[PDB]
Design a protein around this ligand. Sequence first.
Ligand SMILES: CC(C)(COP(=O)(O)OP(=O)(O)OC[C@H]1O[C@@H](n2cnc3c(N)ncnc32)[C@H](O)[C@@H]1OP(=O)(O)O)[C@@H](O)C(=O)NCCC(=O)NCCS
Ligand SMILES: CC(C)(COP(=O)(O)OP(=O)(O)OC[C@H]1O[C@@H](n2cnc3c(N)ncnc32)[C@H](O)[C@@H]1OP(=O)(O)O)[C@@H](O)C(=O)NCCC(=O)NCCS
Ligand SMILES: CC(C)(COP(=O)(O)OP(=O)(O)OC[C@H]1O[C@@H](n2cnc3c(N)ncnc32)[C@H](O)[C@@H]1OP(=O)(O)O)[C@@H](O)C(=O)NCCC(=O)NCCS
Ligand SMILES: CC(C)(COP(=O)(O)OP(=O)(O)OC[C@H]1O[C@@H](n2cnc3c(N)ncnc32)[C@H](O)[C@@H]1OP(=O)(O)O)[C@@H](O)C(=O)NCCC(=O)NCCS
Ligand SMILES: CN[C@@H]1[C@@H](O)[C@@H](O[C@@H]2[C@@H](O)[C@H](O[C@H]3O[C@H]([C@@H](C)NC)CC[C@H]3N)[C@@H](N)C[C@H]2N)OC[C@]1(C)O
Ligand SMILES: CN[C@@H]1[C@@H](O)[C@@H](O[C@@H]2[C@@H](O)[C@H](O[C@H]3O[C@H]([C@@H](C)NC)CC[C@H]3N)[C@@H](N)C[C@H]2N)OC[C@]1(C)O
Ligand SMILES: CN[C@@H]1[C@@H](O)[C@@H](O[C@@H]2[C@@H](O)[C@H](O[C@H]3O[C@H]([C@@H](C)NC)CC[C@H]3N)[C@@H](N)C[C@H]2N)OC[C@]1(C)O
Ligand SMILES: CN[C@@H]1[C@@H](O)[C@@H](O[C@@H]2[C@@H](O)[C@H](O[C@H]3O[C@H]([C@@H](C)NC)CC[C@H]3N)[C@@H](N)C[C@H]2N)OC[C@]1(C)O
Lengths: 260, 261, 261, 261
Amino acid sequence: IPHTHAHLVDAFQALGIRAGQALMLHASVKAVGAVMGGPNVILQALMDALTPDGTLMMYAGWQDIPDFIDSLPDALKAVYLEQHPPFDPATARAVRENSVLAEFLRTWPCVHRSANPEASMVAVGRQAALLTANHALDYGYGVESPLAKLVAIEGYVLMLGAPLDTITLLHHAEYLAKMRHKNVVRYPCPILRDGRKVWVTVEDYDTGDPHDDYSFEQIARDYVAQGGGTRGKVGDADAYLFAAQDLTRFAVQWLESRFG
Amino acid sequence: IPHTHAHLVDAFQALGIRAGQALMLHASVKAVGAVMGGPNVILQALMDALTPDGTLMMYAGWQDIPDFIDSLPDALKAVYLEQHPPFDPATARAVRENSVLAEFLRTWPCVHRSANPEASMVAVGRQAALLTANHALDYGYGVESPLAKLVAIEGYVLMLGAPLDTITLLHHAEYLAKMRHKNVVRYPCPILRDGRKVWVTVEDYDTGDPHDDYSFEQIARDYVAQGGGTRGKVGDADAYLFAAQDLTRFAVQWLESRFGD
Amino acid sequence: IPHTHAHLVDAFQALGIRAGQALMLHASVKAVGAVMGGPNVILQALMDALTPDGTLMMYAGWQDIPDFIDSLPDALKAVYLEQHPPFDPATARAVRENSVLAEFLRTWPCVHRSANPEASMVAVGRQAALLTANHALDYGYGVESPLAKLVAIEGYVLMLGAPLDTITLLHHAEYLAKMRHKNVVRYPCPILRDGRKVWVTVEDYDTGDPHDDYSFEQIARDYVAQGGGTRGKVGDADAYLFAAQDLTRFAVQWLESRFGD
Amino acid sequence: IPHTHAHLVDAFQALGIRAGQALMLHASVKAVGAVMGGPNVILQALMDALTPDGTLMMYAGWQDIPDFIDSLPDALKAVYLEQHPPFDPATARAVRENSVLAEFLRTWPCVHRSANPEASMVAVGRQAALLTANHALDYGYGVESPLAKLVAIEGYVLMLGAPLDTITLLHHAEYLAKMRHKNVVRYPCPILRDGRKVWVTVEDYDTGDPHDDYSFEQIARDYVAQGGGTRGKVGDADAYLFAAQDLTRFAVQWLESRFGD
Ligand SMILES: CC(C)(COP(=O)(O)OP(=O)(O)OC[C@H]1O[C@@H](n2cnc3c(N)ncnc32)[C@H](O)[C@@H]1OP(=O)(O)O)[C@@H](O)C(=O)NCCC(=O)NCCS
Ligand SMILES: CC(C)(COP(=O)(O)OP(=O)(O)OC[C@H]1O[C@@H](n2cnc3c(N)ncnc32)[C@H](O)[C@@H]1OP(=O)(O)O)[C@@H](O)C(=O)NCCC(=O)NCCS
Ligand SMILES: CC(C)(COP(=O)(O)OP(=O)(O)OC[C@H]1O[C@@H](n2cnc3c(N)ncnc32)[C@H](O)[C@@H]1OP(=O)(O)O)[C@@H](O)C(=O)NCCC(=O)NCCS
Ligand SMILES: CC(C)(COP(=O)(O)OP(=O)(O)OC[C@H]1O[C@@H](n2cnc3c(N)ncnc32)[C@H](O)[C@@H]1OP(=O)(O)O)[C@@H](O)C(=O)NCCC(=O)NCCS
Ligand SMILES: CN[C@@H]1[C@@H](O)[C@@H](O[C@@H]2[C@@H](O)[C@H](O[C@H]3O[C@H]([C@@H](C)NC)CC[C@H]3N)[C@@H](N)C[C@H]2N)OC[C@]1(C)O
Ligand SMILES: CN[C@@H]1[C@@H](O)[C@@H](O[C@@H]2[C@@H](O)[C@H](O[C@H]3O[C@H]([C@@H](C)NC)CC[C@H]3N)[C@@H](N)C[C@H]2N)OC[C@]1(C)O
Ligand SMILES: CN[C@@H]1[C@@H](O)[C@@H](O[C@@H]2[C@@H](O)[C@H](O[C@H]3O[C@H]([C@@H](C)NC)CC[C@H]3N)[C@@H](N)C[C@H]2N)OC[C@]1(C)O
Ligand SMILES: CN[C@@H]1[C@@H](O)[C@@H](O[C@@H]2[C@@H](O)[C@H](O[C@H]3O[C@H]([C@@H](C)NC)CC[C@H]3N)[C@@H](N)C[C@H]2N)OC[C@]1(C)O
């Protein structure tokens, strides 16, 4: 029997999902196993556990972001500058490796989407506009980000069969932590400004590689080992539920003690 | 018989105030009528309806801002440049005509205050720091303002016995609207920079008069007439509750249809 | 006896016109008096004094720009939107009040014309393409204007029997000057885009009236009184020759000292 | 015994330097040998050969540009962002490796300086304002640069005992050439905006290393070998005089023939 909407709602509640929470989801559809109605039901069951007074957010990004054009031959780069479409939040597809669930949520009714193309977040619920508002283009995991706001309202992160290395919130901890050196990247990106395409330069800390000798899975496993978070099964998937404030505090101290 | 805290909470909730909302208040204490405990209880009852997870914001400004000194004779202007105190957010009193409630909220525990002297906003609650942060000195009702942020996080405006022409949010609608004519002003203002008094020039759209043949009362009454917002009684006061996003959208379209491209 | 080409060249050189200069001209044909060969000879004599390594520029504008249509009733405005021709730089006639000499220069061999319809400049000579390039539609007397470039390359302004209140360069001084009050306008204009007529909205500082209590004649006469420029006769005309950089610097200071920060 | 002004003027003239030319100089003071009056006389002799109708330009840059701060520990970078002064064209010292002569010319009477900090050019003479005007911050050796204008006005480049690898004009040829790949750099820089320090991001082609398997000395040697330019002695220094137009054309074709796509 495929997992039902009711059984998923109940499993989310048993894990500790409560009405009114703000929750960021990382997921693997395959890890959950067959669901009666497909991945829509995962999202709807989670929303139902949160109720309309809660909020569900996912990292969408932009699957087709042309941030690599400086590596191309000059003639090809010029074609990209002329012909590549800009980031349009109405149509820009979510990064496939962020789970199809992120693309499902991006196209959900009443969804709100943040403006930073590379770091774009999507959310549905009471605080969806708040979480996604005024997402700065530079340092998209920093102070002016949905991650900062998730911490401020004491939200949560749910890992639903997703590897612990994929906790996007830890990029916000990297931003906050006083470390000896962080790598800064500057890359071009087309956006919409006054309804017209404009290429801008985006500045950020490197999010493709760590700034020192560490991994996100290492931080998260250390957090779990010292009693952090709650663990349970949802469908066939191993699930972890973390408080964003405590995990961020732990991760900053973890990074500063080792690399500060 | 003075209105009680409990009855004000009930009246706010009946109007549509809910836990977690971000709310900008315009008020008249006299319109509410006698409250048991005074105007403090109006603020506390509203904060209780919003809960600590909600936010209450008011326009404080600066009662003593010397933005008029260019109109004075040179000798008097010289004294102002030498002797007028700078905007200190810890002490700068709220504009009296913004209601004594704005000054009451400005001095409330855990308050946050925005840095733009003329346009300074004060807020208490979960999003108080967010709303008041990085308030640019130029164009204080524009893109880098608490009003823009209130719209972005889909907050609300509550008129508590206040006239409809006192909706400060409509100055943000003026900023957004593409209009045939706008007045731009530059005026001096003393501020604190690294703990020292410095005189800077602030540039803004004129907020002392409309940019064309309209009034804020016209826009607000037209909004209400077409079903915008909710109306109800709080104490003795007529109250209006507006969604900031919907009101701003309406006002921008209202201005652009009459004076736009 | 009409003034000859040779005598006009000599008069221009005596005034201080030199080979290689970039020169913006304001003129009255009547003030110069009868010229042997007509106004063509005024332009050719000036170009000869400048040599091909110099540049001559005039403000052409567009005599038929329909920037007033927002004031019309909707039915009449609709006809203008459908039927009024767009700004075509090949055919758009210069503003008649800018002197027929501006229209003469607009249709001169090897002329370059800037793209801003209301503020369009025409130029012939070594720096004609440079001066007229990339003239932005918004703020046509501002940073992206031929007037800004004339200042930047330290060109000159020649008043050839033209009243001192017609110095278009002073609109660039207004743009630069930090003043207590500025009027910003938006107006419609049809242009060519990919060979098709398109209506756009242009934003600019108001150039129909000053932004404060001053006149262009007032500024220029003050400049002359303190030793600015050189004066002389060209034909029958009173002539003034100003350095664009020094006049702009003076005018910005003049405006800011009276209406500035 | 030390070289005199009169002999240096003649030596420059013998090379082909003529009245009215626009000339960019690269130099080694040591290569010229002892001059009666010091390096000032090198500059003055060159200006005299060019006459006041000519123009002399050098690449000054900024000796203290902090374009390296991303390589520093984060705590040190924060100090630079707070404490490092901005590029002030009045005081920013020329890059020492650009010759002390560039710093001498930067502080010469009637000098003009372009606004791009890393690529800043200084010039004295009739077209000094033109050459240094509107120098874009991004792609400072490209279309909106003093090198583009030097080509447009048919200027010249003089190597005065300077290595052929130091021909800055060839960075403009790199910009123009359709090459298979060019390296783009983006770096921070403090500048002045409204009299205040502001950190901006500057984008440019890498000028610290070639974009492919070539050197500027290689290009220049090939140019000389096929008859380009003139060569002679000025003091003790080997000198080369190149036409900017022809050298740029040659260098673009050279780069596209070997490294184009
Ligand atoms: C990479 C990762 C997503 C892969 O997990 P996955 O379960 O294999 O992939 P998804 O979650 O996208 O689900 C894919 C399945 O959805 C199924 N599915 C059901 N209905 C579908 C529909 N209408 N359309 C598309 N797919 C559908 C498909 O069967 C698909 O499997 P298939 O394409 O192999 O046939 C996962 O390991 C992971 O890392 N998740 C966390 C990702 C994250 O949050 N990253 C943040 C940035 S580090
Ligand atoms: C102008 C306006 C404030 C006048 O309304 P009001 O009720 O008369 O004035 P206030 O709201 O400031 O309340 C004043 C009353 O508070 C009472 N009060 C109670 N406790 C008080 C205390 N400790 N200290 C001072 N006053 C106190 C006083 O009785 C005072 O009345 P009084 O001074 O005449 O004796 C109102 O009409 C209005 O426009 N409100 C909206 C204002 C706004 O938000 N403007 C935004 C910019 S357009
Ligand atoms: C308004 C102003 C141009 C009037 O001066 P003016 O000498 O009477 O007018 P013009 O310079 O255009 O010369 C007109 C004369 O050129 C003569 N002319 C000679 N050949 C001509 C020809 N082929 N075609 C048309 N006119 C010719 C005509 O006699 C004509 O006079 P007329 O039409 O009355 O018969 C002058 O006072 C002025 O202000 N000049 C500065 C304008 C300016 O630069 N403004 C900038 C924007 S503020
Ligand atoms: C690097 C290079 C400048 C070195 O040449 P150089 O002759 O040794 O150095 P300079 O031209 O700066 O002249 C320095 C000499 O000026 C002399 N001098 C005379 N008066 C002087 C004065 N008031 N102040 C300072 N130096 C003075 C000094 O003797 C000094 O030598 P010293 O400091 O060792 O005692 C030269 O090889 C070169 O490359 N020139 C071209 C540079 C260029 O244009 N680069 C463009 C960017 S690639
Ligand atoms: C497409 N351009 C990407 C850019 O978007 C950027 O995306 C990173 C993205 O690469 C990064 O994912 C990394 O982390 C994932 C997880 C296993 N942590 C190691 C797997 C993919 C791996 N690249 C995300 N955690 C954060 C996201 N901002 O990374 C650098 C880049 C290659 O230029
Ligand atoms: C007593 N008659 C009042 C009338 O004065 C009226 O005055 C205030 C009026 O005083 C107030 O104006 C102030 O605000 C203007 C602007 C500069 N605020 C930033 C400039 C004038 C300044 N006095 C308006 N913003 C709001 C308006 N309601 O209020 C209602 C009323 C009952 O009609
Ligand atoms: C008021 N005195 C008149 C006047 O018409 C005057 O004409 C023009 C005057 O007409 C002209 O203004 C016209 O042009 C303005 C607009 C077309 N751009 C500036 C709007 C007002 C309009 N009258 C001014 N820019 C310059 C002025 N010299 O000439 C002197 C005179 C004939 O005595
Ligand atoms: C201070 N930052 C510099 C930057 O300004 C920039 O400097 C280059 C500079 O590196 C380059 O000069 C190099 O080539 C010359 C070499 C061939 N000597 C004969 C002079 C010394 C050497 N620095 C100049 N031709 C152009 C100049 N823009 O690039 C390198 C850099 C390290 O990022």
